[PDB]
Structure formats: structure tokens, C-alpha cells
Symmetry: C3
Subunit: 430 residues, 3 copies
């Protein structure tokens, strides 16, 4: 833990130094450096560099102005290396990629990507890290959802290093499934010589199972580079303090941070705030109920957000742009989890699925129909398993949210309970 | 459109002239002419005439009095013809029939009619126009629901002009189904020589499918004759203005109209108002949610309405009757539709049917069970089709309600969302 | 009815006299006699006696003190007999047993008991009288739920008087099922020579059916002995007045009664009050909705009650105990029923399970999916029967709750409608 906190704090420190350096090169004010659109452009440059450029926004003469600068790719690479104490440091790079992936996840639905690959467009929750490149980092591999892995594999199905890349990806997906039966199917997908339709069909099946028997997907709170640099500049030593991507650290950092965004005339700044908050804590596919309780204000479904994407296209004019503070804080914090919830065990149940009438009174007599009726090789075993599962089944027993004053996470608050972010659109009301 | 508005306006004008003429013959005051019970009796007379009579109510000496008048059937027919500029005009007749059908639909459940025909009494929504005679008008044919058509066909199943009447009715029903598979079954019902049990069974199946893959049924706002006559009298020329049964016209007319009803001692006049409002806009089987949003006050389920039927039986005494204004106006208007909603295409989906846990917190992990589990000749094709459908699926995309000031329907209001009128009774809580 | 009221009033009178006598022997104050923990100890003594003892609590010097007294079993038996006018009176004994069973039902889940017997722990509602001994009283037999009977039979399955006891119990269970098909299966369980796995499997099946096609289980309001004794002492003659276990009597008695409970530091006295109220009226497995409407304050699920059991273990110290009034009254009363609700007939339906769109507006088009899709030897007959049933189906038509002033139950109040008491726990949110 101390050693993990050490190396994590080391990469965040590197990103920080880089960002400050990059902010001096462009002679940006501290406020301008803390504009999310400027941070993304800087982030994109160091990612693309591994000439390059993008739009950079300045507060000139009372109005927001856009400049499209350029840098030699060799120069950026040198700047990144030297901010990371000589080392090539690919970890900090993929950390900024996962941040970008989390924002993509929160902003865009990729139904067009899903349909081309023959997948159901209702597989959002499975699609964490879909915009993330194939053969990403180890952290990138961990952060990718089950569906992302299924999608990547079908693209493979549609030069014997192709074989190892196919088997590596099969194993990534396998390590994510929490039931042996799901894992055993992945073996049958992997053990195939010349994979094709049977494997394709198997992978579509596995993705569906992962909507109920959910896979183990990592979640890492990853913040815009401006947040880390800002902290480094202000006198915070991530190497001496350590740092965590799943503990209290990122919540505490945002609590001591102020990020800005360019805002269009039609846009609600609070709705922009929610979007970037969601992205920051990898919460695009979380239950809106828990996201809300944690944040302390309602986390509204995508379709009821009066906001477009963070990035301002070159198409639109800057004279109508204003700049707003992004509200990225929270009432509570909570540990980010690798788990997909309970899928295994099924040790008893303990509950009530019907009533026995005591009083002679006119009413309906409620009962849990799907559960009662439920009780009436590896493919059918999975069917039987997800037929047993209930939406009412509780996961993460005993685990709760925490006060921001609760550094060591000593006193869990268990919340007494609209769930789908991408559930509210012109085709479907979920 | 101009030509449709022309001929519609022509028939409504005819009904109007007729009603005014009929109101002079009986020497009724304008208020008395605008009593819904008097209008129905006049409507019934001209329908029956194609001796006849019914109860007519007058305000005599501070109390409501009932008289049972009679007219020669030849005389009524002459009055109807001459109000319709010579022409026999059967259109205006069936328009008053559809008005009556709409009121029946709103007032009475016909479960006894359904059970005799071997149909499920939960097929309300399918039963628009059931009290309407077989071999009605073309408008009457259009207005009839899928179940009505199924019921009429089973009565046929239970003189070779019997064959053409059987095939005509099969084709009516066919033109109402929006999926080819449903249509293809109707062909198999029609192509049968000596129809019997197989056809009966097929028709019961088709009616069930029409609860999910809903048929295209016309909806026409049809008002008591007193409303048209009142408008004609007051100086509105339906021939010069044109008129529509599905556009803004009937809403606008009711906005400029005042209709009365006789009200029993136990009755809430607002609940009477809702009933006749529903009937007026053919809304008996509409989602109560949309009916409400349109009207602007709650449209309550049948079983929670403190009201009996509009018509006062000869059995009951007039000395306890009062007269109340019927509130038949609306906050908004909306176009009446022929469509049964989306049944076809199924081009992708776009939505979210599960969550992926981000935070280690105690909760249930929601998922859309029926949808996820769903994926695990013409009869089974239909089964497969309605198994794909979801209650959450959106129809009439982009289409919305309108302000009464919005004549041309330029600015649609899309409403941000108890659905069943006949769902709340002593046997069932829906 | 008069004769039933006679003998019931006779046994309650007996329990009363006994309790008063028992209260004098211990020289308890009237307040102390009306402490629920003292009443249970006295109740337990007369039950165990058919040396014996238990904890008795006194108000000594401003603090609550515990004494563990002992009595010769012969002496208690003599006291019970002589309070019941010579007669051995086993009825009053089983009445106090059913009271204990009702409290157990309300306090403890017996999932551990269920899993050992191979039953689903979600069968709470079926488990009325599970803590009640096998071969109880006739009243005890009547009060036992379907699952209790199934559990008792499997324990038999796991000395030819074993055969008669097996067949007697089969018949008890049979008389509880309201459908012939369920009854016919019990015949097949009973007609078995050397019962085993097939019978075990059949009994698990029958219990599941009883969650939807619910069995006829008696419900008897049974009160702590202190309530009866208190009434006898104060000048109420149950023999002259008669008494009922299912009519208004027990509600009226509690309305004129004051019972106390020892309360732990962490405990909410209102939540203790609910628990003992539930037990009193055999309402552990009732719909919380009806329990609430009757009582007039919310009847909260088990898991949201800030209270442990009524009985204070010898382990814990008395110096932190306080004494609180138990609120055991009710806004309304309602007749306790033998019925399991409608399971038979299925004469038509009358309802609405879909809508037909009238207005061109954007929305989802709701429909009752499970009901519509439903329509697409004795084991499958039962499957078919419970597949027809709907949670929305109404039982006890016309029957309602009553004002406490309504002795003769003349004016039923039909309530316009969280259902499961044991539905809200760390594994399941129901
Ligand atoms: O205190 C200090 C502490 C350190 C440095 C400066 C100050 C300091 N010097 O002056 C003032 C004034 C200060 C102050 O009060 N701060 C508030 C908290 N700040 C902060 C905290 C964290 N993390 C945790 O506290 C944490 C607790 C458990 C896991 O993580 C992170 N993070 O990245 O995790 C980022 C930031 Cl910016 C640092 C500044
Ligand atoms: O204006 C007039 C207009 C015409 C005649 C008289 C007046 C008029 N002369 O004096 C006053 C005062 C008047 C007035 O303000 N009115 C209000 C609207 N009235 C009305 C309107 C409609 N339809 C539409 O407006 C419509 C708009 C788009 C589709 O339909 C219908 N209809 O049947 O459709 C019935 C009636 Cl009664 C007519 C009277
Ligand atoms: O009146 C009396 C009536 C009798 C005795 C004393 C008094 C009396 N004498 O002085 C006062 C003052 C009194 C008084 O007002 N009481 C209130 C009601 N009380 C009571 C009532 C019932 N039952 C029914 O009333 C009932 C009505 C229908 C079914 O049952 C039961 N029960 O066991 O059913 C237990 C009790 Cl304690 C009796 C006392």
C-alpha cells in the first residue's frame, strides 16, 4: 500500500511538473492554466507526441480568444521525459488517457460503434474504456469494461502475433469474470483455432451475462492535468504524501482545487459540472442514486442535462463564450471498487417475496412474480445463474460512504435506499 | 387538406343547421338546447329515424321537468335532409354515431360482450367503436379498434353475401395492423373456406398481439350536436372556415362553447366533466398521463370517478336533478393520431439496462431483467416480435402538445414523463 | 357464534384468574404485573410446567431489578387447574402458545431452520407457527401456515404411530389449500408408502405455489396474559360478555389496556410498540400497507426497527434498563381472516392492461408485459394456475376496516391503495 502510494504519487507528480512547465511555455495565467479546455489540449499534445497542436484559449481584452498553436513532437517528448526525472514514464501517459476515456464515457454514447460490431446498444455499462486504444497500459487494461473487451475481440475476429494479441485479450476478459462458468466459456473462445462466428456468438452471450453477473472492472479517479499541476505548484508533494486513485486522495484534491470550463450560451454550468464530476470519478455507468448521495446534489440523467461536450470545436465562434467554475466537490467520498458486486455464492437468501393476509380487507395481494416463477453445458449453466439473480439483491454488504474528515475511512455511512445515466433518451424511458 | 377541411366543414354545418331547426321545433331556450341530455335525445332521434322519440328536459317553474315527446320518422328524415342542402348526407349521421361510440367507450366497460365472444375482458384498449354497428360508415370503419374488429369477426364465425361481408371485415382489420406478420395471419383467416375454430383461435391471438404491437386506429374528436348548432347559430361558418376532426379545430370550438349536464345528488360535476371531455376527444383508452398533461387537471381512472352515465333513465325522479356546466376545455391541444405507435423497424435501440458499480457502497444493483432475459411460422414470428417490445419504448418521437394560441402547430411541447382508465376496479388494481 | 363466544370467553377468563393469582403469589404491584417481560415469564412457567422458573423484574429503590425465582411444577399445574374451574383446560394453554408463536413470528426470521429443511429462506409468509410444537392444539393446527406444515413434514421424512402422525399432518396441510390440484398433490404425498425424495420435492413445490395460490391459514389475535388478568381484575367478565379472537373484542380490549416493556438504551419505544402490536394481531406476514392503515401510524419493515427482542437475556445488566408504555392501540379495527385470498374461480377479469394512443405526442406506450405474455399432470396444472395469477388481483372484495365505535361491523371502510416486513435486510431490498 505504502509502495503503491509511492509510485502513484510519483507519476502524478510527473504529470504535475509537466503541466506547470507546459503552462510557462505558453505564458498562461494561473486561471487560464486551470481552464479544462486548455488542460485537455495540453494533455492531447503529450499523448499525440507519443509537429502537434490544438486550440488554446486566453482571456484577451475582456473576451475569450482562441489560438491554434503548434509544437515539434520531439520537443514535447523531451519536456515530458524531463518532468518525469529522466524516465520515459508511460504510466502518467496512460493515466491521462484513462481520464480522457472517463470523460468520453460520460459524454458520448457509442451506439454506432456497438451496432457495427453486432452488439446491443444497451450495453453502455459494459463499455468503460471503449474509446481507449487496444493494447493500452496495464492500468488501461484493468479499467476496461467487459463489453469493451468483447468489442475489441470481435474486431479481431473481423502475422502470428495476431494470435498472441488475441489470447492476451481473451485472458484480460477472463480475469474480469467472477463466475467460473463465464471464465470457462472464454477458454472455449480462446482455445479456438481460426476464430469466427461461434466465437462471435459466444462473446455476445458473455456480454449479456455481464449485465447481471457483472464482471470485475477497475475504477480509477483520474483528474485533468491542470488539477495535479495546480497542486504541485501550490506546494503539495505527491511523492512525499503518496497518492491513491481509489482512496480518499482524489476527492480531497478536488476539494482543494478549482477548475474552469468554457460555457456555451444555452448551457447550464451545473450540468457541465456534473458531467466532469462523473468523468473525474469514473461514474458514467454508476447508479445515479449512489452518485447523488455521494455528491450531495442530484446527478441527473444524460438526456436531462442542458449541456454539450467539454471541448469547443473550431467551428463555433468565441465571442459568445463565457467561463464558469466547475463544481467538482462532494458531500461524501467513497472507495472506488474493482468488484462487479455479488455474482457467486448464492448462500441462502433471507427475505420476503409474498404476504399472508391477516385481515379481511379489500386489496391486491402482492408477490414477487419473477422470483417465485424463476424456479420453474456452460451456456445453460450461465442462463440458470442469471435467472437466479434479482435486481433486489444487495452487493458490497457493510461497505459505505465517508465524511471528508474521515481520512482513514473509519465510520462508513450506509445509505438508506432513476438509476441509468444513459437511460433517458428519445427512444427509451429508463 | 383544404378539400378535406371543406367537406368536413360541410357535414358539421349540416349537423348544426339540423340541431338549430330541431331546437326551434321544440321551442327550447338556448340554455336548454345546450343541455347534453337534450342533445343526445335529438341525436338519437335522427339516428333511429334512419314514430320515434325520447326524454326532453325543460327548466319549468324553478325545477327540471322531463317530457317524452314523439315525432314521425318521415318528418325527422325530411328535417335532416333539408338541413344538409338536399343531400341524403350519411356522413354527418355516422359522425354523431362515432360521438355516441366515444361516450359509450368512456362510460361503459363491455366485459360481458367480451366474454360471450370468448375474448379477454382486459382488451378495453382494443375495443374502440364496439357499440358501433357492424357495417358502419367508412369513418366508423376507420375509428374501430382492433378488438372491435376481432369481436365482429367471431360473431360472423358463430346467403353468399355473408362471404363478402366476412372478407371486407378481414381487410379492414388487415389495414390496421402495422406489421406484415400480423397482416399475413389475417390473410390466413380470410383465405379460409368455412371459417371456424382455427380462425377463432387466430383472431384471439391477433387481438393479444395488438396490446403490444398496436394496430393503427383512427381517433376523431366528435362533439355533441348542440356544440355545432350553437356555433352555427352564433355566426360561425364551418363551410367557409373549413373544419378538422384531428387538428386544433375541435379544441378551439370547445374553448368557445358551453355545454350543460343534468347532475344527480351524489355526483361530482368535475367528474362528469372529465367523462364527457374524454369522450369528446376519443380518449377513453389513452394514457391518463397524456390526457392529464393536455387537459391541465388530473384525468382520474373510471373507478375513482364519483359519477354515473350522462343519460338519465326514465326510472329516476327529476325533482332531485340539478344542472351543471361541463368543463370541456384544455390547457393544451394535441393532434389526434391514426398511429398505434412504433411496432416496426427495431433499428438498434440506444439506452441503458444495467449499471456498473463504481463505488464500494452497500446497495442493490439494478438491471432490466425482462429485457436482458428476453434474448434467451407467422405465429412464432409475432411472439418473437412482442417479446422484443418494451413498455419503456418511445413512440411519436419529436411530436408534442401545443398552446391553444398555436393555430399552425409550430412549437411542440414535449412532456417530461396511473395510465389505465379502466384499470382501477374491485377485481384489479392497475 | 354465541356458543363459540361462550367457550372462548371461558378460556380467557381462566388465563385471567391464573395471572392474577400468579401476580399475588409474587407480590407484584399492578404496574409490575403489567410488564410484558413479567407476563412472558409467568406464561413460560405454566407452559413448561406442562421445578421451573425464569427472570422476574421489580421496581426496587428507583432502579429495575431482576430476580430468578423457582416454583415446583406440581404447584403451577394446581394453580392453572383451579383458576380454570377444576378442568384441565389445555385450550388456554395453547392460546398462550399461539401468542408466543405470533411474537416469535414478528421478532425472528428462521432462515437457518428453513435451510436445514431444504426450504427457500424467502418463505417467511408461509411460516406462521413454525416455533410452535408439532402436534400442537387444534387452534395451533389452524394457526400454522403452509410452510410450517411443509417443514414439519420434511422433518418426518428425515413405531407405526409415525404413519398416523404423517397422515394427520398431510390432512392438516390439505385442508389449507384452496385449489383442488394442490390438494390432489397432498394426496399423492400422503398415499406414499415409505415417503422420501419424491415427496420432499413435492412438498417444496407446494410451498412455492402457496406464495401465489395462498393457503387458508387462521389468524388469532392473542394477547399477553397480563392483558386478560388486568381485565378480569378491573371487573370485566369474559364469560358473561363472551369473547372473540377474530372480531372486534381484542382491539377493544387493547384499547382499554396498558402494557409495559423493559427498554434498552439504544431502543425506540415506538418500534418496540410496533413489534408487540404486530404479534398481538398475528400480523408479522401481513402487507405493511394494511397494517399501517389499520393502526394509523406507519408499520415499518423489520430492518428499519431500532429494537431487539422483547425478552431481556440474563447476560445483560439491569442498571441501564428503563420501562416504557407499549402503544398497542389502533385507529381502526378489522376482522381476522382464515382465507388466503382468491385462488379459485378466475371468472373473467375486468381490467385494462394496455393503452391505445389517441394523441400524437412523444411518450412510452405502457402495457402489462407479464400478463400479456402469460398466455404464451397436477404439477403443470398448478404452474398454469399461478402463471395466471397477478400481483394486481384483488382479494376480499367488499370487505373493509371498521371504526372502533362500530361494534357490529356495519360500515366497512375500503382503503384506497413497502409490503414485506422481512423484505428489508442486508442481503435483499424488497
Ligand atoms: O494540510 C496540508 C497537507 C499537505 C500539504 C499541504 C497542506 C496545507 N498547507 O497549507 C494548507 C492551508 C494546507 C491544507 O490545509 N490543505 C488541504 C488538503 N490538501 C490536499 C490534501 C490531499 N490529500 C489528503 O489530505 C489526504 C488525507 C488522506 C489521504 O489524502 C490531496 N491529495 O492529492 O490527496 C491534495 C491536497 Cl491539495 C493540501 C492542502
Ligand atoms: O374570431 C372568429 C373567427 C371566426 C368566426 C368568428 C370569430 C369571432 N367573431 O367574434 C368573436 C368574438 C370571434 C372569436 O374571437 N371567436 C373565437 C374562435 N371561434 C372558433 C374558432 C374555431 N377554430 C379556430 O379558431 C381555428 C384556428 C385554426 C383552426 O381552427 C372553431 N372551430 O370550430 O374550429 C370554432 C369557433 Cl366558435 C370563433 C369565434
Ligand atoms: O363498558 C363496559 C362494558 C363491559 C364491562 C365494563 C364496562 C365498563 N365499566 O366501566 C367502564 C368505564 C366501562 C367501559 O367503558 N369499558 C370500555 C370497554 N371495555 C372492554 C370492552 C371489550 N369489548 C367490547 O366492548 C366489545 C364490543 C363488541 C365486542 O367487544 C373488551 N373485550 O375483551 O372485548 C374488553 C374491555 Cl376491558 C370494558 C370497560
Amino acid at each position: 500500500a505504502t509502495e503503491i502510494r509511492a509510485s502513484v504519487g510519483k507519476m502524478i507528480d510527473g504529470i504535475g511538473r509537466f503541466y506547470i512547465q507546459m503552462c510557462t511555455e505558453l505564458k498562461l495565467s494561473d486561471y487560464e492554466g486551470r481552464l479544462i479546455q486548455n488542460s485537455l489540449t495540453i494533455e492531447r499534445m503529450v499523448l499525440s507526441a507519443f509537429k502537434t497542436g490544438g486550440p488554446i484559449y486566453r482571456r484577451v481584452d475582456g473576451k475569450w480568444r482562441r489560438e491554434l498553436i503548434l509544437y515539434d513532437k520531439e520537443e514535447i517528448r523531451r519536456i515530458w521525459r524531463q518532468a518525469n526525472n529522466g524516465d520515459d514514464a508511460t504510466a502518467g501517459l496512460t493515466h491521462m488517457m484513462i481520464w480522457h476515456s472517463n470523460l468520453n464515457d460520460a459524454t458520448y454514447q457509442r451506439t454506432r460503434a456497438l451496432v457495427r460490431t453486432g452488439m446491443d446498444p444497451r450495453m453502455c455499462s459494459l463499455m468503460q474504456g471503449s474509446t481507449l486504444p487496444r493494447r493500452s497500459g496495464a492500468a488501461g487494461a484493468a479499467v476496461k469494461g467487459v463489453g469493451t473487451m468483447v468489442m475489441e475481440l470481435i474486431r479481431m475476429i473481423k502475422g502470428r502475433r495476431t494470435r498472441i494479441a488475441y489470447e492476451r485479450m481473451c485472458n484480460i476478459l477472463k480475469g474480469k469474470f467472477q463466475t467460473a462458468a463465464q471464465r470457462t466459456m472464454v477458454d472455449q473462445v480462446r482455445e479456438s483455432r481460426n476464430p469466427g462466428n461461434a466465437e462471435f456468438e459466444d462473446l455476445i452471450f458473455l456480454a449479456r451475462s455481464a449485465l447481471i453477473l457483472r464482471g470485475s472492472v477497475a475504477h480509477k479517479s483520474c483528474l485533468p492535468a491542470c488539477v495535479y499541476g495546480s497542486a504541485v505548484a501550490s506546494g503539495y508533494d505527491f511523492e512525499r504524501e503518496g497518492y491513491s486513485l481509489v482512496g480518499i486522495d482524489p476527492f480531497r484534491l478536488l476539494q482543494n482545487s478549482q477548475v474552469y470550463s468554457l460555457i456555451r450560451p444555452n448551457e447550464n454550468p451545473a450540468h457541465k459540472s456534473q458531467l466532469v464530476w462523473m468523468a473525474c470519478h469514473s461514474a458514467a455507468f454508476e447508479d445515479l442514486r449512489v452518485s447523488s448521495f455521494i455528491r450531495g446534489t442530484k446527478v441527473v440523467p444524460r438526456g436531462k442535462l442542458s449541456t454539450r461536450g467539454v471541448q469547443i470545436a473550431s467551428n463555433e465562434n468565441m465571442e459568445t463564450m463565457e467561463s464558469s467554475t466547475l463544481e467538482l466537490r462532494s458531500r461524501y467520498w467513497a472507495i472506488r471498487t474493482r468488484s462487479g458486486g455479488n455474482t457467486n455464492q448464492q448462500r441462502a437468501s433471507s427475505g420476503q417475496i409474498s404476504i399472508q393476509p391477516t385481515f379481511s380487507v379489500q386489496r391486491n395481494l402482492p408477490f414477487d412474480r419473477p422470483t417465485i416463477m424463476a424456479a420453474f453445458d456452460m451456456r445453460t449453466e450461465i442462463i440458470r445463474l442469471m435467472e437466479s439473480a434479482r435486481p433486489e439483491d444487495v452487493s458490497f454488504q457493510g461497505r459505505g460512504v465517508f465524511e471528508l474528515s474521515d481520512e482513514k475511512a473509519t465510520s462508513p455511512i450506509v445509505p438508506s435506499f432513476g438509476s441509468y445515466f444513459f437511460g433517458d433518451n428519445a427512444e427509451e424511458y429508463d
